[PDB]
Ligand binder design. Structure first.
Ligand SMILES: O=C[C@H](O)[C@@H](O)[C@H](O[C@H]1O[C@H](CO)[C@@H](O[C@H]2O[C@H](CO)[C@@H](O[C@H]3O[C@H](CO)[C@@H](O)[C@H](O)[C@H]3O)[C@H](O)[C@H]2O)[C@H](O)[C@H]1O)[C@H](O)CO
Length: 370
């Protein structure tokens, strides 16, 4: 069982756990309640294990898409923020933490892919996907290329694919309609076709992955790349003069990158649920709390309006939220796994010539709504 009278918190080792510990120190100063932050290896794999036996931390931090699985096994307690507190956060973030109509976690940070560009090679980045082919041609005559990004993960290619109307699962009836999938529609076919053509016309290479694209941009060889806030650190170290902006539009429609919300859930087996609520709502989710964590390790964009408004003073952060609001919250339902694998395959096959674009998406669609 979990010990009563204190709070044990789990957050990944790449996050600002030292800053989080300081908020916990503040909590102890004001309430006398001790807080312990830990960052065990593969914590998101261990949580389901220990939580199933009534053990584990009182609070766990992780991207919201993993919380669907946890809530499915009843591992997270339903949270009770009132209307007033909910209005302190951007409305769309609350949707990322709702399962069977119930709120099961507190939104902390918000992330989404953005268009990253080299200001020295490209002071005026393209506002549309359509003008990249021509831009690539003129940059080649200069010894450089226009764009390079990870094409191995559907998470990275979806922004373009979904731009003109694509979606994973329709969300209206309170939750997701698992039979209403948008990977087979005209918009997706159009998006995936433009993507495949960029490869066929040699503006991109079907084999490019995360490391290949990162190295290219951080060396100054390609003018643009598509990545998230987690990649800025490496770019900073490379000293390339870069900027972060809204993703290019396609067919006049904005790219729709998936959105991941770092969230804080409360262990269903915790005997300290009220303490957890007090800490999360009135200590962490305040300008002072997030500041303490952010100073340790940047959170990127955040769900708390007041603090995000301050952070948006950084154009890279402002662009991150801009792209997020034009994006699609990652579905937390069990069916999303089937979507990831089917779409990953469709892209690989359409780019290798194993299947035409239409046939690749047609099969992915059928496999998902299976
Ligand atoms: O520095 C931390 C940072 O989060 C990195 O870990 C970074 O994460 C980002 O990019 C991921 C994509 O590479 C995002 O993952 C989501 O999308 C993928 C789909 O591409 C999902 O993966 C699922 O599908 C694949 C098949 O393609 C399968 O192998 C996986 O098992 C299955 O889960 C993820 O589940 C989504 O979360 C992530 O949100 C984002 O932060 C990169 O991972 C660094 O390479």
């Amino acid at each position: 069982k979990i010990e009563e009278g204190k709070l044990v918190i789990w957050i990944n080792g790449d996050k600002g756990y030292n800053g989080l510990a300081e908020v916990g120190k503040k909590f102890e100063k004001d309430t006398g309640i001790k807080v312990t932050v830990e960052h065990p290896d593969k914590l998101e794999e261990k949580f389901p294990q220990v939580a199933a036996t009534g053990d584990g931390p009182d609070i766990i931090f992780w991207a919201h898409d993993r919380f669907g699985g946890y809530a499915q096994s009843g591992l997270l307690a339903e949270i009770t923020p009132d209307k007033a507190f909910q209005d302190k956060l951007y409305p769309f973030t609350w949707d990322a933490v709702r399962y069977n109509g119930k709120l099961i976690a507190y939104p902390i940070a918000v992330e989404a892919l953005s268009l990253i560009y080299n200001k020295d090679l490209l002071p005026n980045p393209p506002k549309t996907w359509e003008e990249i082919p021509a831009l690539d041609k003129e940059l080649k005559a200069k010894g450089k290329s226009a764009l390079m990004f990870n094409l191995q993960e559907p998470y990275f290619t979806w922004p373009l694919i979904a731009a003109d109307g694509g979606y994973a699962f329709k969300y209206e009836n309170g939750k997701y309609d698992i039979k209403d999938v948008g990977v087979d529609n005209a918009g997706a076919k159009a998006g995936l076709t433009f993507l495949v053509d960029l490869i066929k016309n040699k503006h991109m290479n079907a084999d490019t992955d995360y490391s290949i694209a990162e190295a290219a941009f951080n060396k100054g060889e390609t003018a643009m790349t598509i990545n998230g806030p987690w990649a800025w650190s490496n770019i900073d170290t490379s000293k390339v003069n870069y900027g972060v902006t809204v993703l290019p539009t396609f067919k006049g429609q904005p790219s729709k990158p998936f959105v991941g919300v770092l969230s804080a859930g409360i262990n269903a087996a915790s005997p300290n649920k009220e303490l957890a609520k007090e800490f999360l709502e009135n200590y962490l989710l305040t300008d002072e709390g997030l500041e303490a964590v952010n100073k340790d390790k940047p959170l990127g964009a955040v769900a708390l309006k007041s603090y995000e408004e301050e952070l948006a003073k950084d154009p890279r952060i402002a662009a991150t939220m801009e792209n997020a609001q034009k994006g699609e919250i990652m579905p937390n339902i069990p069916q999303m796994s089937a979507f990831w694998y089917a779409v990953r395959t469709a892209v690989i096959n359409a780019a290798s010539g194993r299947q035409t674009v239409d046939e690749a998406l047609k099969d992915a669609q059928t496999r998902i709504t299976k």
